Design a protein around this ligand. Structure first.
Ligand SMILES: OC[C@H]1O[C@H](O)[C@@H](O)[C@@H](O)[C@@H]1O
Lengths: 237, 229
């Protein structure tokens, strides 16, 4: 299809179009990407991801078209301790993507340790929310980063972690300008913006899958996806 | 998801979210449900169907919600014969639906002979365009339409159809038009909750028995959103 869109105002436990990987699962109408105990508390050494089953047509060589898309979502992080790790990320990757071996902790379940910074060995675009808890490639402060085939963000902006508070995020890609814009805000109006120019055609295959990934190494916290809407349409360029 | 939409203004041969069953395949940016030879002419004894990959959340028991959906599509039928058959149908069925053994010809690849008229043995809502007088029929768990209206078969002309379901009135409305303004309408009240499971798949089916014709799906757009009834 040239156009595709779907919306999850909440996440009921009766799911049919979500691909669950690692420890990801539904609890209390939300997606718990990282493992939680019976008390609903976060645990260490856990990784989880989800993908929408339908494949998205990102670009079409044949017609020289590239999709215009936007993903809107909300998440919250919680922990008994004052801070947590490691972070959550929205990502776009090849349809058959699976959790790489040894991609826990700071790798957010997105990259393999041996090729984490090798742009030629990866095909992925991600918007990460790093809670910088525990000191090496990205800035030494919590931030929102845009990753293009590397765990080392090509662009970042300072960010603030607030326990238990939902962050509303809007990610958009405009094929005529090639700008991938990210806007995140807390209910009180605190806003965070970061954008980057990138030609998705040279980074990802024509058909891709979209979803989220999160991980906790030694330090932990829950990475709870609360809502998610996505729309995409191929446009002539 | 509570809401889902997709649109195929055309059907390029590079598809990833379509489930092809029977002889259905893409040819010339269109879906050819029934088999065609090398020259592109229709042949006898052929059945084909396609379903969209992602399951549609039709209704939800917990929240007591039911989906408001719209399916807009266009197709054309061509046949050198004076009596092309058998027809094409838009249908909604359980996720694991497959072509029933012996469902060719008049059964349109939708029902099995033994239970084609046994409502209790089927779970499917379909809107058929039968050409073997020609008519538009609304099927609910049976090949025996709950109602039909007269229709005209125009060889090689595209018919634009809009099928909608309003959970508030439980009305399933069908509107079909030819490019000259010729209009056909038929409506039926039905509670989809009592007919289909909460999650379903949507697609099209077509077949030709001894008499034949091409069944070409040219475009298709679908949208669905759960609402409070
Ligand atoms: O094609 C016309 C006709 O051919 C055969 O007689 C059977 O397959 C029927 O079901 C079908 O209606």
């Amino acid at each position: 299809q040239d156009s595709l869109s779907f919306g999850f105002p909440t996440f009921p436990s009766d799911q049919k179009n979500l691909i669950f990987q690692g420890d990801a699962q539904i609890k209390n109408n939300a997606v718990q990407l990282t493992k939680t105990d019976s008390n609903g508390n976060p645990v260490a050494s856990t990784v989880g991801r989800i993908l929408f089953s339908a494949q998205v047509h990102l670009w079409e060589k044949s017609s020289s078209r590239v999709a215009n898309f936007q993903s809107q979502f909300s998440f919250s992080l919680k922990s008994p301790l004052s801070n947590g790790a490691d972070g959550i990320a929205f990502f776009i990757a090849p349809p058959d993507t699976t959790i790489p071996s040894g991609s826990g902790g700071g790798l957010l379940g997105l990259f393999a340790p041996g090729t984490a910074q090798n742009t030629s060995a990866n095909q992925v675009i991600a918007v990460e929310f790093d809670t910088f808890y525990a000191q090496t490639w990205d800035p030494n402060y919590p931030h929102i980063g845009i990753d293009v085939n590397s765990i080392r963000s090509v662009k970042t902006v300072k960010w603030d972690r607030r326990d238990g508070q939902s962050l509303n995020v809007l990610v958009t890609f405009n094929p005529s300008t090639r700008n991938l814009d990210v806007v995140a805000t807390y209910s009180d109006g605190t806003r965070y913006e970061v954008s980057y120019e990138v030609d998705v055609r040279s980074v990802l295959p024509e058909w891709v899958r979209v979803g989220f990934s999160a991980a906790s190494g030694e330090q932990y916290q829950t990475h709870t996806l609360e809502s998610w809407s996505f729309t995409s349409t191929l446009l002539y360029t």
